[PDB]
Design a protein around this ligand. Structure first.
Ligand SMILES: NC[C@@H]1[C@@H](O)[C@H](O)[C@H]2[C@@H](O)CCN21
Length: 850
């Protein structure tokens, strides 16, 4: 029943090994070999040993000699074995790109067999293995994402010097008797009422002994006893199907906020001769998922019979695949703190623990294969990625089987994308469908993330029309342009491009000269945007910033205007899709922001940055996705209430007020007694009329109060009398240009106001600290404290990360008070007392103790 992951390896280039067979013999000298932990790429391992400088800073990464990664590298460990009574197995995946496998001097498998990042292998090594010290070595071959059915980085970042070559999941050393137990899972079916479920337990048994046996596979599923006895010839594998098991009132798994996230347990032992031979424990969820095309042809998801607007972002792991379980939980928690329900994974499909965590938190996942390299090389034409040869087809098929087998019992998984930009052809699709069938993977199969259909599964129901770079907020409200990225159908991957991180992050990722160049010349290439020429610079963003907010006075000015621009755009991006979700015709059915986070330190395509800091894009998404939310439509001036919760709400008041930058109220409306249905339904409070007398730049304050009088949503907009308009005719694939620009430059001259702050910190029994901060606009005038940003910092004024606020980037009118809560791990203070740093657009900066 034993499965023990290999803790670590020493690695070295094959340049230093002239007899392969000598690596895996007990006693082979490893003078100068680099010690690495489990799940390390080669570069990750060399970084761990301090061999190269931090690639998150400047062009450090450019300075790594890449040539050394065009040959094999070895991963070697010893393995103590006290006994050869039990058989021995290597069970693993995550080899990029392929490897030879050696045990004690014998080559047990070649790189023709062990090939493909996602392919699992189960190598019986009983023959080679002896008592005492054993050695095992992988000779891992160079990775080329266009040639290998592997992982590559598209245009998200810059190419990692080793191209991730190595072993990026665990290798398990399994022991067991004559019978090996594999592939235990539970098929689960819920009635439409959600009060009864039927369970089919399936589990493979394999007799690897030389003699025929009887085996009993027994254990528990969801608290219920199960038992089957079968015969196995020598070397025979059987799939055991257990009789149906009824489960009354199942603790149904729900997305976050819609209920609990219970997983049930399956626990099994294969015995031989009234003696345990192998055992496996796993978990599953009781949850129904559907993804169907609506009458408009848009892909529509529903969980346990409840339709959902998918609101999420494209997730990426670390650029060098450095794995850390807490980091993964921390990233997934941010999804919830943002109010998002989903993460998309375009390839780079994470280790299991990532999905246990998503399961435990109720964050929905949309895994799948990636575009723009080998996976799509047979269908994607001149796009990078090599046409397939015959040997590719089984690797591809086996990869789906292995992934489908990993993922089938994780309730968070809602579909698998078998294509990204291009749908697979018939042969390739049939190989995926058969693989999924054989794995009992029963989830929706989405043929592509673009509009392109597959020959069997058919239409995707999704759209990939861009944009991926600067568009103004009103663009997101377009339903007129069918080749564009407005709020309709299912937006599988889109954003407004550049997302300048916080000043603290910037100072950690870029040099003074690099930062100088960023604001002065946005047209210049940035190593920390992308390797692609199309997205190598910040020009479009730079141009729009200057035009819309006014020319940048200095770096501080640029960055402060970037956050406003990012908050403004991401907010509208999400808000538009929330509003249009309940349209009769061509509703929005999904939005995946490109992207949730970055593989590394970046300037684009992110909500939270590599260090988990939180900027304007972060707060904008968080604002847009509040559970009970008031918003302003950039297209038609409608004030809309959105209810993301699972129950209808009543007796709401929606209050809208416009202010000039001198603080003069120019419009007021109070809409009492609104009702709004559950899970994304909306209500209209008012359409703001054309108000005469507004300053060119002005403010809109939207406030939502429940029937108890509690303020439940506050939303402040900086608007212009001068409209954003689009030159549609002049679009290309990645953005639509502007024919005219809004004038928000008024904000440059907004008078100073004040705040107004007091902070206290409680150190909990769960290892977390809560810092509470009460803010008050203390000014004696009529000017609001606009865009007030609070940060939990240590004694040196360095932000404490990760962190989770109930709310932030707030705007308070004179006399007004809000109380904010920040939760974080007490140990992440590293002994410091907590403080709070408080910066407003027009309030300067102060730090208070906490
Ligand atoms: N999977 C679609 C790809 C993304 O992987 C890529 O980052 C983005 C842009 O290059 C436009 C195409 N789109």
């Amino acid at each position: 029943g034993n499965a023990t992951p290999i803790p670590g390896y020493v690695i070295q280039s094959s340049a230093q090994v002239s007899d392969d067979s000598a690596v895996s013999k007990p006693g082979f000298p490893t003078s100068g070999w680099y010690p690495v932990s489990s799940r390390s790429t080669v570069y990750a391992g060399l970084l761990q040993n301090g061999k190269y400088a931090d690639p998150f800073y400047s062009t450090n990464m450019q300075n790594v000699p890449a040539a050394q990664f065009s040959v094999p590298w070895w991963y070697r460990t010893d393995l103590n074995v006290d006994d050869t009574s039990s058989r021995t197995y290597l069970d693993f995946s995550g080899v990029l790109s392929k490897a030879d496998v050696w045990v004690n001097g014998t080559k047990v498998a070649t790189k023709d067999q062990v090939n493909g990042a996602y392919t699992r292998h189960d190598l019986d090594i009983t023959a080679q293995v002896h008592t005492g010290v054993n050695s095992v070595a992988f000779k891992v071959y160079p990775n080329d994402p266009n040639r290998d059915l592997s992982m590559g980085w598209i245009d998200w970042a810059q190419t990692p010097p080793d191209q991730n070559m190595g072993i990026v999941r665990d290798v398990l050393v399994r022991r067991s008797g004559a019978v090996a137990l594999r592939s235990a899972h539970v098929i689960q079916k819920l009635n439409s009422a959600l009060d009864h479920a039927d369970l089919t337990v399936k589990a493979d048994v394999r007799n690897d002994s030389a003699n025929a046996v009887q085996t009993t596979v027994a254990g528990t599923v969801a608290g219920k006893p199960i038992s089957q006895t079968v015969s196995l010839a020598a070397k025979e594998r059987k799939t055991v199907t257990f009789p149906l098991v009824g489960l009354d009132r199942p603790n149904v798994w729900w997305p976050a906020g819609m209920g609990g996230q219970h997983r049930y347990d399956l626990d099994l032992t294969a015995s031989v001769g009234g003696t345990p031979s192998d055992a496996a424990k796993s978990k599953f969820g009781v949850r129904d998922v559907k993804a169907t095309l609506n009458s408009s042809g848009g892909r529509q998801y529903s969980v346990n019979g409840k339709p959902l607007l998918i609101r999420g972002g494209g997730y990426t792991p670390d650029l060098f695949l450095r794995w850390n379980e807490t980091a993964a939980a921390d990233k997934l928690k941010y999804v919830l703190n943002l109010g998002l329900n989903t993460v998309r994974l375009e390839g780079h499909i994470e280790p299991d623990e990532f999905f246990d965590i998503a399961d435990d938190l109720g964050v929905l996942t949309m895994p799948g294969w990636e575009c723009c390299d080998k996976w799509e090389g047979q269908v994607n034409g001149e796009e990078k990625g090599e046409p397939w040869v015959e040997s590719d087809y089984p690797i591809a098929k086996a990869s789906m089987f292995s992934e489908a087998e990993r993922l089938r019992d994780h309730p968070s998984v809602i579909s698998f994308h078998i294509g990204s930009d291009f749908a697979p052809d018939r042969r390739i699709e049939q190989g995926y469908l058969d693989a999924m069938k054989a794995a009992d993977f029963l989830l929706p199969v989405i043929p592509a993330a673009s509009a392109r259909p597959s020959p069997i599964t058919g239409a995707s129901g999704m759209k990939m029309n861009g944009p991926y770079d600067y568009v103004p907020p009103v663009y997101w409200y377009d339903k007129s342009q069918k080749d564009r990225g407005g709020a309709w159908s299912f937006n599988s991957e889109t954003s407004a491009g550049v997302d300048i991180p916080t000043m603290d992050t910037l100072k950690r990722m870029m040099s003074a000269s690099e930062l100088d160049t960023m604001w002065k010349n946005p047209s210049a290439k940035q190593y920390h945007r992308s390797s692609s020429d199309t997205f190598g610079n910040l020009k479009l963003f730079g141009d729009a910033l200057t035009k819309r907010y006014g020319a940048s006075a200095n770096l501080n000015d640029f960055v402060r205007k970037a956050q406003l621009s990012q908050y403004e755009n991401v907010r509208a991006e999400f808000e538009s899709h929330s509003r249009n979700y309940t349209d009769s015709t061509n509703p929005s059915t999904g939005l995946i922001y490109w992207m949730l986070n970055s593989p590394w330190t970046s300037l684009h395509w992110q909500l939270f940055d590599a260090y988990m800091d939180q900027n304007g894009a972060y707060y904008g998404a968080k604002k847009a996705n509040e559970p009970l939310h008031i918003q302003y439509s950039h297209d038609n001036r409608s004030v809309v209430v959105i209810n993301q919760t699972s129950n209808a709400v009543s007796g709401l008041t929606a209050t809208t007020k416009l202010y000039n930058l001198d603080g003069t109220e120019k419009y007021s409306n109070t809409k009492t007694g609104l009702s709004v249905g559950a899970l994304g339904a909306k209500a209209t409070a008012v359409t703001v009329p054309a108000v005469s007398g507004l300053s060119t730049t002005y403010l809109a304050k939207n406030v939502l109060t429940d029937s108890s009088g509690k303020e439940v949503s506050r939303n402040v907009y900086w608007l212009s009398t001068k409209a954003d308009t689009l030159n549609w005719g002049g679009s290309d694939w990645y953005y639509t240009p502007q024919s005219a620009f809004a004038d928000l430059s008024g904000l440059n001259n907004l008078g100073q106001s004040a705040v107004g702050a007091t902070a206290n910190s409680v150190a909990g029994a769960d290892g977390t600290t809560t810092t509470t901060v009460t803010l008050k606009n203390t000014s004696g005038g009529r000017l609001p404290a606009f865009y007030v940003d609070s940060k939990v910092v240590d004694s040196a004024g360095k932000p404490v990360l990760p962190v989770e606020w109930n709310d932030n980037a707030v705007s308070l009118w004179p006399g007004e008070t809000t109380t904010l809560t920040a939760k974080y791990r007490t140990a992440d203070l590293k002994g410091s007392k907590p403080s709070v740093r408080i910066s407003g657009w027009n309030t300067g900066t102060q730090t208070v103790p906490a």
